[PDB]
């Protein structure tokens, strides 16, 4: 039948841990429904960039759960890898000994920030009983074993463990040496006064701004003072930055006025990743200049994104000053959003 | 025992498919199961995992003795399992897909472990020119590939955007630079051909020309410099290099573009020569591949060359190329005898 | 505004729409006030 | 009593590997006791360096083990750190 | 299931020992057994593996309630195993061991784990001044752990090939250098006190004292440079790392050595100095500490000192001293808002 | 302050917050009074 | 299955300790070596010269 | 022959080595090929 076999061993590969939890007076930790509290983060050393974190309820969730104190496991972080794990929970009584120690039937299937566990782990009420030895003197102390699983491969045949190797490109790197040594620079990049200096072909050939302003047929006396009037020092040694090596650490403190830099330089990548930052900022009153800035700089994308998390915020972002001041000063805003909030989400009927 | 999560699961796919023509099918001559390994390709979008088909001729097992089995395989990854699903189709003589077949389910991958189908396609049947499969007797098979990523939630924003975000497209204007010409700022002479390219990038992308073009030179020859160890057609392929960083037609003249590499030092021409060279371990070449080695210190193609020569020595010696090195540098054969003595010291 | 509100998709490409907007933008802030809660559901 | 308790519960760390030694035409070993063959070196991958080699012989050494095949792991390299570890062998048929 | 290694063994043990003392035994009044820790310490040799002694004035339960135990705890390692031996024994009045208590074996070591004598010695004997082991209420206990190391062979020729190499003197060198103070070039003065020494090496040490003696400024500086911020003792402590670094009495004088550190910008020294006050965390030093560390950037100890009045704040902040730092300087605390309110469990 | 202690996070970019923290530190502090029983578990 | 026998503990700091690095001293002796830093003596080797602090 | 492939992992150490192989390599060659050929193609 229509199957998938390998023609090769299929090894498993696995390596487990355990931690411990201690919680020093438990039953003062409140009393109500549905308390989730977490864990502190730990590894077990070998994790290779991988932390687990745990999630005690002490009142679960659902219905019947309100006599019961459920757990899971959430995975803190990892290298955007999936994961695949085995846990079993254990408690440990006044003599220090695994007592309510149950195991799941397989391993489970794990990926960042997914919670596993066992719901109704354990009955609240008879845990609160002192004869148990469970809680000496309110110090509670969890203990769970995971057993992480792997599965890669291994085998000494076939003489390939050296294919050749390859190291990673340089090229921006390299521009990023010719930004710091600059050395050979070309034109002389005045911008508020102070004086920075860059290289002519590679603002020559990377916007259609800069290549208009230097192919007027007039280059080596305005080359040489070149005077740039609009922008900071931060923003252009930024952008210059970016433009050498294609990167700009600080673009979400420094997102408008690159965006408007850009625009006056029309530079579309950055623009889109200054789009990009602007939209992964937004609050409940930022968006309505935000809006301003966008129509005054053909900012689409962040264009229909503002627009519709306004149309889904709408009933707080109104009642904003600034949302009233855009109004009066920029009514074509305001009519768009209307626009798009028209045919959507109710057309019925 | 049962467990919830009281959180929301998402699945994404980023596919991708790659064609591949095996010219001379008929005698390709890979018998017993013997693999005619593809070259390895990447994810495109995130090549951070590569890939590469891995092909019997004859397939594999008395079983599928008179079918050609196919089963992918996987090279490389950042030590994880992938869950990606797979297409198969075989274009006819007009270039349409025929035969297509796709997998049911996800079936796991790790690296090292291939997943496929048995019984692909009858062997004389794919030999039969009354089906058209094969053009010129090149066999073409075009592969779909789909990767499965399944995260959970995309966290607490929503994160909706779009916000296309393209590569840094250096290397499209930075060889912009070159055909549109720009009024560049310096000049290059092979055999007469007139080149003309700009001081600056050559500065920045290696400490040879750098320091050459700026050691007095640049003064009295600041546009126009003299190159006379390099060919015209071995040149272009370079310099298009030393624009974009990724050569299209590399392997074609991988020898020469290593000899000019070396010559200027850039490591990274260096080892994707390296790569390129390593992709015709033959038994009959590995005489002019330590010549290449020695010539250019080529550190990792010299212990591959040297181990796969070490495997291959009963082949290898009948070579009168084997002699004539021996002649010329035997030298070379006494740090072949230090790995192989080194691989056997005790026994 | 419960009619302009229904037949938005073709009362608002008119060029009297237009000159109203521009020279009055205040009243159809007051409609996107009034649809404001409309949409809220989703 | 004589005891030095150690304050602490017992947590246990184990590191689970297997390798496959593939040898083809081993019936033309160089057949003698006493001999000395191995398969290259290996190690888990998160090892945290600790390498491992397997070795086997033509023929077991000794006289009690002339028939039989003396079979033997050496630790390759390590960070002069001592090493618990249970090992285990079998075949593939 | 069993083998043999057909290969050679021996035993080798690179011992040590480590005085230590605290003071005031009498009223030291840690009840309920919470640990009284010594500091760390290495064994000398492989200065990467640290020792240190945590110690119960009361024994734990009422199985030890009324003897005083005692036990060594590993601060940590380079993830290996140690199957060390050691020695405890209290000096008597006389300076002689007295109360010996020796493992009958080599006990395994991991890092966090420890072992030693519960029920070790009787506390109101060790106390009664007629014994004669406590001279001017003190415990000078002299520990001597020796740790053994075992080996296969030294990978066997056998062939000892190793002659008994004495150690790198550079320390004793200069050590003896500055302390019989032979060829000085260059004159000090603090406080009427002089003093003189050689350039070249401070500059090697201290990059601001080359600054200031790298811009011609010798004629009139080399023979009448004089140093305001630190006082003839802790300025004879300052020559004394200058030319060392082995810190030899930091405890003591700890504060303004630290302050004039970072005065002169001593790197390792600066964290040495952190060291120096990082085992004294208590409920009123601490508002005085934090401000001293943000005067002069103690970033490590920063951390670690908020930290510790962040867990302990609901009785550290009633004290005088935190009065008066929020009087003064408050935005300290802004800096501590900003840390905490971001970390202990933000609910909630 | 128990609003306050429950914002922390997005209240520190507040201008205002530092401004009260400059003129009226001693409030902030009996706000981290107030979150030292807050927090005791975890 | 090879073992290690490693120890873990829910909650640490409290005492706990701080980053100390390696005694950085000597190579800044190196340094007074290589790059010479006010010189104090004069060497020949066959007439070699070479300079040094006394 | 047979004597250098079983001691080769000292006998390379002679510096006679050096002066022999450097000033006549035919007998190098025959000495790859007797540790090659056989006793070796395993794998």
Same mark, same amino acid.
């Given at each position: 039948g229509p199957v998938a076999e390998s023609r090769c061993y299929t090894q498993i590969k696995?390596? *487990?841990?355990?931690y411990m939890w201690t919680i020093n007076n438990f039953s003062f930790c409140r009393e109500e429904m549905g308390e989730v509290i977490k864990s502190s983060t730990f590894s077990s050393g070998a994790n290779d960039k991988l932390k687990w974190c745990l999630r005690v309820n002490p009142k679960g969730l659902d219905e019947e759960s309100k006599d019961y104190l459920s757990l899971y496991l959430l995975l803190v972080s990892?290298? +955007?890898? #999936? =994961? !695949?794990? *085995?846990? *079993?929970?254990s408690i440990l009584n006044a003599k220090g000994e695994e007592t309510k120690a149950m195991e799941s039937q397989r391993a489970y299937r794990f990926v960042q920030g997914k919670?596993?566990?066992? +719901? +109704?782990?354990? !009955? !609240?009420?008879f845990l609160l009983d #002192?004869?148990?030895?469970l809680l000496p003197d309110d110090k509670l102390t969890l203990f769970c074993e995971v057993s992480v699983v792997q599965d890669s491969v291994n085998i000494s045949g076939q003489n390939t463990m050296n294919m050749v190797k390859v190291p990673e490109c340089r090229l921006?790197?390299?521009?990023?040496? &010719?930004?710091?040594?600059? !050395?050979? /620079?070309?034109?002389? &990049?005045c911008? $508020?006064? %102070?004086?920075?200096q860059a290289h002519k072909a590679i603002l020559a050939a990377r916007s259609p701004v800069f290549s208009a302003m230097f192919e007027h047929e007039m280059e080596e006396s305005k080359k040489n003072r070149v005077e740039i009037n609009d922008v900071e020092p931060e923003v252009f040694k930024?952008?210059?930055?970016f433009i050498y090596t294609g990167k700009a650490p600080n673009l979400d403190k420094m997102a408008d006025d690159l965006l408007a830099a850009a625009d006056k330089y029309a530079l579309e990548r950055l623009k889109v990743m200054c789009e990009d930052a602007l939209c992964s900022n937004l609050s409940v009153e930022n968006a309505a200049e935000i809006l301003i800035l966008a129509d005054l700089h053909s900012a689409d %994308?962040?264009? /229909? %994104? $503002? =627009?519709?998390?306004i149309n889904y915020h709408a009933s707080d972002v109104l009642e904003t000053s600034g949302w009233k001041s855009m109004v009066v000063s920029h009514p074509h805003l305001v009519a768009e959003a209307y626009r798009s909030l028209a045919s959507a989400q109710c057309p019925f009927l």
């Open positions: 696995v390596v *487990k841990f355990s990892c290298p +955007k890898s #999936e =994961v !695949r794990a *085995k846990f *079993k929970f919670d596993w566990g066992f +719901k +109704k782990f354990i !009955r !609240r009420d #002192e004869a148990n030895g921006a790197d390299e521009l990023g040496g &010719l930004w710091e040594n600059s !050395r050979f /620079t070309d034109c002389c &990049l911008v $508020a006064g %102070q004086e920075f930024e952008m210059m930055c %994308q962040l264009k /229909t %994104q $503002a =627009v519709d998390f």
